[model samples]
Target: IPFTRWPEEFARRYREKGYWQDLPLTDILTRHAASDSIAVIDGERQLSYRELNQAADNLACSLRRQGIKPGETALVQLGNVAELYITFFALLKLGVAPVLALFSHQRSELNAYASQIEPALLIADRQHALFSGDDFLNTFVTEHSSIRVVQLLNDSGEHNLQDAINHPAEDFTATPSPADEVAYFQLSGGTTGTPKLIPRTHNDYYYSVRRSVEICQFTQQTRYLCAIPAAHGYAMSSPGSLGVFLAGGTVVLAADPSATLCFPLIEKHQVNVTALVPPAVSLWLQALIEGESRAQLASLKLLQVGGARLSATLAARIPAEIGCQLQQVFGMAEGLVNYTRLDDSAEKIIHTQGYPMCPDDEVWVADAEGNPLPQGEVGRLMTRGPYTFRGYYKSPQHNASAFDANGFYCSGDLISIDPEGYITVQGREKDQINRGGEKIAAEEIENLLLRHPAVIYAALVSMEDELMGEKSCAYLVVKEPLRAVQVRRFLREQGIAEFKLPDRVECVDSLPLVDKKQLRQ
Candidate 1:
């Protein structure tokens, strides 16, 4: 059963005030302007709320001068920096839809996204060349003749459009953008090689951030430290750029998330909120346990972990060993995020993805044939929410299969929920392993493998077998190379069920990636 309950007063206010009906995102940042509070910190450089707002306004006015207007799209490929926030809010104020792109993207992936979105303008950080081997921006402009303007943020005294915008009027007024108009477009891994575009309207995106702040119990005093790439949807909304702007809180940017950098920042700045992936969290916990850093993260009230499933054992050790509250966030750019609240136990937080953020968000469990299953019965998970995507960029067939007649998007994930509203993720339906007739969740095995000392990363895939139909095959990236027998012995010692243990093991130098998405196969 779900343990976290929304505060009655907050719930009543959220409903009666119609907070979800208004686009509070772009407007909320204005409240903190000139408050004397530091809005963003990157290394020795720091910007106040007032400075951030002015930067955004200056950029927006310049964008308008370049003939990029409302209803158009601007592709922003940036890293974790103050410029990302300035560019994002600038686009919003101009009423232009910004498509957030990762800096890691290259070649066909980058070209495909640009062509698919058909952006009118492209904004890139010239200081940090995304891929040194290729001239990505030039190639993109050459290919897409429709692209009218390209702004490169540079500090090298080079001639660029961003420099011209620096002296533009910072007193520019925000255009009247409709609440339902697309504020930003977030992309996800597509089904048939094309990337899926998730449109986040002003209203939906604004409410998502507000709900996150309330759910995590963040206050104006909260100091959010951003360690992950802010471009990604998960980090953008949660422990990300949006949280600081909307919650009237401070954002501390760590240029490098290494222990050397992060430890000192944590010690100097009283960082209250932070979000990290499981691997990073594990490393931080180890550092704290080893007494290498004198940073008392006790000031950190909330630590959110997402991107992948977190283990229960690791989750349990966090509060006891790391000295902070842990929250698990399960979400995608396609919308529908489930976050374990502060009140929940470590077991609940780690085991379950928590309940839906709002009543309007619907979830279901279905079998292979897209048939809904009863409560407590495991099946493929599907969800539909006000914030969820109606369809991909231009794929009609994918849309048809992804959504039902009622418009619920079928998440490729498999899960089961209890009558009391607790949702437990079984695994990705596609990643399920079948050994004879016994079905095993790859995530379950993967989580178990990660608990071992030597294992850095592990993935389980079903291998075709003549006698058994399919057997569990484990792909591992170890901190130190270990034999399959040693891994098996460790799993046995951990009390993992014998049938679930991998029969075959494959060791590799590193995992592969195809267009930002991890390639399991």
Candidate 2:
């Protein structure tokens, strides 16, 4: 099986309701050929819809000839460049499920993904430090025997990605996976030792993107700035690049989200909409005041803040300071995305994350005992819907706890829904740190720390931060003295994302383990 399938009844209902179009995800690109508008802008480069479709075909045909087949998987790691989109569509056209790892991910995270998926192919960029040489690829291929093909963006080798994209493949022909099967894997903001993979089927993911386009009112004239990681669910389909493509709009790619880099690009390309995490938004706002950056936002119609909590105080400042409509998005890589609508009341838009775009989406707020709560009472968020996934990829043990007996996903988010179906964000119950909207699982770090010979015990926890909503702090019972920098350097040497390293490390006599029996007193 390509992936875990939704129940037959659920699939039938989705089809009957017109949510499942039964068309491959590549339809998003192929259907736009008639207009042939500019699809992606990567600095000095540009790709029209027709050009992108051709590139996808060329790459897909090359991979097919290289012996990669449908139903198998590929591990793709690239930056927010036009090639990312081309690679995405190419794999879809070939019916190869791909796990698009964030460019920030390093060896530890990539190895975890490789173990779970056992991908048949690896696509990466030489620009990343880990892939700057052949050593990492050689080691990676040896460790994971499933990886048969390797392709790099900047490398001029037999497996060069650019060569594949430009290669002639007029005879290319392949069948796409069924719309109900997995199209790609989205990485979860997990709370466990291993980073989880979310299986997003073509049908469910397409429906989510379609509804998002409608809700956001995307148009052919819409020019979006993709400054965040392109693979992120919030940036990919919270009316993101796909939304832009579906509407035959333009996606202007930025290497980073700093105000200095993005402001000029927005001005130059007339970018109308973009998404940012709260910390990045704060930086942009601060830079706007420090310079003439506000003038560059004349064409920017909307700014979406998500991936973490956005304070109402900061939310209120966007329209006044940045001269753009502030849209607060609350979404997960798994599926459910809540957006504050453009036409919503100011109070609702500022105070709450908007309602579900799909009318059939089912959301529940329940008490600690799993009993349903009143409309305005804060409780654990549980949801199951047309687009929300039923299970994590190859994670039966985690699924048993992630989902309740009724199959509703326990999102571990503490929230309350108002009578009007709007949701208010409270906090998270999971042991994860939202460091500048990058999730760092406590267990993942603690497990890595324990591997060190000097460490006896490790407990990772969250600490308050002004910039990032929360930062990680490691409390370790160690065999010897360990400085914060030493601990961070150790994690860096393990080849994990810099964001996952603890902001502070504390050497403690012992971890504060709670005694449940004594707490009852």
Candidate 3:
């Protein structure tokens, strides 16, 4: 249950400096629960704050009755359904930290998390068809003996989550904890074989959420559409749904981010604001350009884009083409989030990802030798401040390399800053692929590719793209003739984020090594 703790000196300073609010994440719910304000929207279903809170309480009490306790962790694998929020609130109330896995994750990724966290509970949805049957419940529980209970969002049997939620809420209150303790584990957008865990505390995260809420103007009237995976750091807390909840605003969610699906949802929900990665923005723009009815977006006020690099041309087109105020977001799950302010000039908004959310953010754009680079010069973006995590959870070796002596987290992002402190992301120094804002860890995919018997060796690298920003190309030296279809089928079987799958595979007789790097040509 322990993680790599923050340095005592820094921790104490954060507390004394009012950066740490020392409040629970559940406070985001409780403070708004008394009102009958709309809290969540999933298709036709709309939940009031009171209803959401009560449902969470029912589930929390049920979990407590079933022996899920404080200090325990759960592996939560759910979809873009309303129940995701309900379950999230319940776990926070019960003091059960969840390693929230994206629904796109499969056995290898989940098994890695299962082994790392050794969670005591498992919550999933049968809709995904990965783990739903009674046989799976028993077999998976037996395989991972640490897991005591399994609940499915769609099941109506003994393991039914709806039944659990229908249980009386009268029996329980929230579990207690130190505000500085880890609230939940955030998955890293990292390039390692295994996804790293980020330990976010209630104090640090709340400060971030509140600041986002303020900057984004999250009011009860704010209808935010979580088009991206709500579990992602950008969609989850870059003043995401949590910020909406903090403002007592309504949260509208879609099953996916495709323009076909999201356009109708936006019109139906009258969504004033929504977040998207660069690719999704492109899709929407393309759809609209193909003569989508402008009336559909009459209620849309602002569109926020980030995750991958956004071109200036696309950035400028958002307001004129889509008819919304465009806000560019640049953030990481590890902690530091940068956003272009709504009040900033159009040029800065199109050119730079605005200043850090917190004014006290310490950003050091430094050269390879760790010397500070002058303004407008490309350098590695290193930062440490309130709401930014100090180290990866339980990664001592990585911590050594990732942080400096004074404790700046070395973000692998290459960026240049202007005189006004607006940051322009140049590119990444890390060996990873950015496929439409989704991080494809080269090693993670390479290991999965290696699992294929036909693949003797594997390498994944980035290739340029106009819309997606970057797409993955897999180079393989195979034992037999392997087609792109075979490689895709192998990867799809592995259950990774669909974007992580290679756009193309280059079959080679062998890979050449240069400076310990595998070369495709």
Candidate 4:
């Protein structure tokens, strides 16, 4: 597929303006250090700009001694902690590509990612357990024969690998990483129904973070509290670990989102910026409603929400009841991101995924034939941008289909762009549940079902129908037994528009899994 052409005028303006010449990540950190500032804070450990640089330098030196060379891939799986930050930046300084793995991932998924990338080293926290029941390290070592060394980053503080942290005898010179040299690999479930590694170069990753900082209006005054797992692309980018470095803001890492664990960090650090998924936001809101803390969250200025859509009721209740701005975040690992900017209205934040940040990027809805659709018409949302993934790791067949003739990545999501540029996701193009002539977004129904008190997880899919072309059938796993009528009644009470409710529901002890993978059976 030919690469999408940027508008000549925009390209010329960008080139003349030199938007890409913004500080490289390392320089960004150095500038912060020169300003005499704190860069990261977790628990009692506060790292100033100089301290952070020293830590990265020491870790990079240690990694070099361990024989990790530039361009080598390192698999990193750890929770939201100081170790994750240190190890990641250290690798960046060494020009070693780090592949971010979710701490919750295990078994075939873990093996699949490790094997696909064939990483030279795997760094994981031996003491901290994210997925309680699974022995991920054992499985990772068992499945990956190519992984040369396994280093355990001790999170428990009982044992430090300080002795093992050694620099090479040879003085290491930082390699000049070009815009095209792969810097990081962010994995996501692609349209092909498998994990796809999206390659982000230094320029891509750096600029993406810079764009986010600019969009969020992040300043040195911004003290970000990151509760979401930094491994996830959304978290990794938006107020992700990188955002703070770009803006020279202090990042407060919450190992878990429990209000008990998170609230104190906010109070102690005076967190002005934070990001959370809908569930975490609900928990915080619940704590605020229950009056669980005497410490006021009044210092919190920005609350970015994503991973799933925030219900209008939840959004309204947040600022009105709890007193923090609720901003919507929408993006994928492949790199296009949209945020309801700081000044946007509450309704816009609640209802729509805001406009694109990169002015050079083009977002539009396209029909099945790949033809552009009119505004307000729902179809596959296709995006063309400088930062979008050029191809999935070593997958040519997927690349052929996922990119258009003009090189625009076809995001398989069904969405509609309003005339005003606001985008609303209708559903996945393949996952949409067709009910007679009415098409229903499976994600919409699933989100609605999740709001039900008894429901634990819900998946809505299309089932064959004679009267209707296809009908909606929900396969659900709940905390307790829930009849189809009960589910419908709850959804109705939640004010879910009648047309969007499931036509039928099937109760199951648990959703069936293929080889214990949590994805669709």
Candidate 5:
């Protein structure tokens, strides 16, 4: 399939407007680095900018020797470890765009990406159960004929990733992808039955990160904690770790966002900033109430809550409980990020999802009929901008509906804009359940359930929850008796992520016609 190119007219204007820098994303590594300044913190180990750059260069050189080249794809899965960043930059240097799958993703998600990209390289963590042994890897490699090189995180073998990074190549030449070409593919969190890839070019992605760093006011001394999955768009570039790196700041990685793990790191590293989803924010607050010391987080200066609907009630507590300035972030993997300005009033920070980072971002709030809505009136969001994506990779059938006649992306988010341009997210129009910021497509799960021998009818809906905001409940008409545990276990066996498993299951004699109505709940 041919890659989608931005219209020449718009591309010309973007370059003339000075939005696209026309440089490889790897350029950021050398631009802001002081060389000796610390670039990453993973537990007790640290890597300076010089060390990080050398590691990526070494790996890139080795990859080049192994026949990897530009335009080919790689599928990568790793946790919040420093190696993740190392792999990321290494691929960029070689111009081998990667699909950075979330660590929680299992065979189902991984296979979807592999099928789409026909990746030539597979870099994953051996610690993950899916790769704990050679079983799954052996099968995956056999099934995907394009996969030639395989590397593991905690394994010592011919395919070990650490060895690729540690050993220097005798000599090799590298040619990165053009700034306007696909630098990487970001997975879509949408209602689509199959996982879709969003091709993010270096020019557009770099602009978003650079503009984000400026908007968020990151500095050389900034110590940002990355407690969420590193692959998440929020953690990767909502003025995320990349933004911190662009500002020549230090990034501290936490395995997860539990207060027990992150609070101590915040103090030990004097980490002033971090980002979390609404559910993790709730967990941190509960930990404080359960006798966690407030002083441990004294060094923290900013807390960014995003990835889900952050209720104003919960948003108001961050400053009081965590004792940091709360910055609400709203963005998508495709592109276009909004941030509540650091100097904005407390009310606006708590209420709105902030405004677009680019002045050229065009947003439309429209009613059901696609007519424009008045300011402050809720409507579907349609946007086209220098940073926003034009289409999904090879998904021509779906792209026809996802994008409009004017090239505006129908984001499926119901939102309202204040006179000042601050966006207030009202709800999502897509058939998805927001479980603790993880998007679960209703059609995807329902189709999986119907594949079971006993499940005659299956419908998935969202139920309100305090911590997770919403949890999925599967209402089913089964041919045989089934319990919630049984239903969950069956889904788990299907290789879906744990979060996508139905929180509750209901078996009935017949499903209601209202299943369609309840789906919108």
Candidate 6:
């Protein structure tokens, strides 16, 4: 089944107004394919637009020959490598929709992704722990037989992605899909065990990229470092890599975001701009404060920080200490991307996450009953816009719970808005914890912990963590007695991400019940 689509008249109006152009995602690459300008750099190697397009073409031909057709789904998990971009463009060119899974994800996460999309192809690397042995891949393949094409990245054996790309391809017979078709699946920061997929189209996503290119003042000379997770919404397309290529600029890929590693890459590649989350920004700021030379980062021009609330004190330090402009990006995979523009006032840039990408974006800051809040008063943030998807992919029940009757998606972000249209995020109202921008649902963990035989009651709560912005804490009222290590071992045996494991576990005598009926922590 195709993804939920936008309202017919709304889409029509967007297209007529020149916002939703009738161009495929590949147009961004094909437009610059003749240029010799560098498009991507991954350590020892780089690819020009010409070479990038050729690699995409070769990969596409190989897939098509193996019967990977348009509209077929593929699950992709790769590090911040140049091949990731190549394969991404190849999937779009071949008219396939790829579900971009984060590299940190293990079997449980991957299984959730597979169940949602039922992908026919799986792209992953052997370096990842889950994919290191045959048991994991074998178990997955045996469970779901729909997956036919297994393209192992960095693998020298069969289904090797590099070997496929190296073999020159002549097949370009497969045509482009419609511009409004589901281009790819982006995972939502959900508060449930069931996976949530946000479907983005070529028209809607490219518009954001084009706007981002202009908003950030990126040009042909722009050299951007992909510092964050490549699959992340902010890092991928809040005018992310796609925007960099749209301007024919060079993209530098960093394997990880550690300051020890990134500082040297910036000097080597002369990266002009890069994006990071609040935690990375804190680390970088800490480094510069603790005796790192500021002059060494001279090539950097702008550093974008988002994913969670950035303290104003920390925001102001970018230009003062690092000698680069700071851009605040507040966006979710479900779509509305708010950016602090390059030309915005210094005060506004430091304090608020600037206005939405599109001026026509309809937003509401309202109370629990849907009443509009007074100017500058805190309320839940809701929005319906051209670029934002109308619904979560194949999730009618969650979509109903998430969106209002007026079609505005309730983002669960607590925010206050000034009359000028800019918004300052107060906090999140979702039943989740923001641990360095990765959402960990409190309910999911609580449920998992309560499953243990020794546990009678469990409450998962968020605690402020300087390094990660937030860390999970579990309070348990057990039947007998359970230590923190024992509880952790039991949870780990259930196969969840390390991030979900509570940083601290406390054994309590009684539950913290606010009202006799309500469970509170």
Model 5: lDDT to the true structure: 0.89
lDDT value, residue 452 of candidate 5: 89
Among these predictions, the greatest lDDT belongs to 5
Off by over 4 Å in 5: 32-34, 513-515, 518-521
Per-residue accuracy of model 6 over 467-504 as CA lDDT, tens digit each: 78899888888888788899889887777778788899
Error of 5 at 338 (Å): 1.5
Q: Which ten residues in a row have the lowest lDDT in candidate 2?
A: 512-521
Evaluation by TM-score, superior candidate among 2 and 3: 2
lDDT of each: 0.71, 0.88, 0.85, 0.69, 0.89, 0.85
TM-score of each model, paired residue for residue: 0.78, 0.97, 0.96, 0.77, 0.98, 0.96
Cα misplacement distance, residue 148 of candidate 3 (Å)? 0.5
Looking at model 4, report the run of 10 residues with the lowest lDDT sum. 158-167
TM-score of model number 2: 0.97
Cα shift from native, residue 231, model 1 (Å): 0.8
lDDT of 4 by residue, 1-521 (tens): 11223456644565565555533456656566555587777778787777776666777776677677777777887777776776777777777777776665544345667777778787776654532323655565667866766667653342244433433224645552444467778875433334568877665667778788888888888888877666776666775767877777888887766788878887878888788766677777788878875356878877887755566777787777667787888787787887888888766888898878788778888888878888899998788665676677788876788788777887677888877789886676544554533335565567767778788878787666543445677788878878899988787665433545778898878775412224444
Question: Which segments of candidate 6 are over 4 A away from where they belong?
Answer: 512-521
Tens-digit lDDT track for model 5 on 198-313?
Answer: 99999999999989998889989889999999988888888888888888899999889988899889989999999999989989899999999999999988899888879999
Q: How much does each candidate deviate from the true structure in C-alpha RMSD?
A: 10.9, 2.0, 1.7, 9.3, 1.4, 1.8
User: Comparing 5 and 6 by TM-score, which wins?
Assistant: 5
C-alpha lDDT (0 to 100) for residue 92 of candidate 3: 94
Off by over 4 Å in 4: 1-17, 22-24, 33-36, 128-143, 155-161, 164-172, 190-193, 293-295, 430-521
**Model 1 agreement with the true structure over 1-521: per-residue lDDT tens digits:** 00111234543554565645665467867777666677888778788778887778888888787788787877777778788888888888888887777665544456667787788888777654453323655667889876898777663444364564466674578873676556777876333434567777677677777777778777678788887777877778863677777766788887645666777777788898888766677777778767765346767778887666666877777778777888888787787888887887666776787887767677988888878889999887788665666666666766777777767777777788967687876666444564643345576567768888888888777666643556788888888878889878887665444666799988878765311135542
Q: In candidate 6, which residue pairs clash?
A: none
Worst 10 residues of 1 by lDDT: 1-10
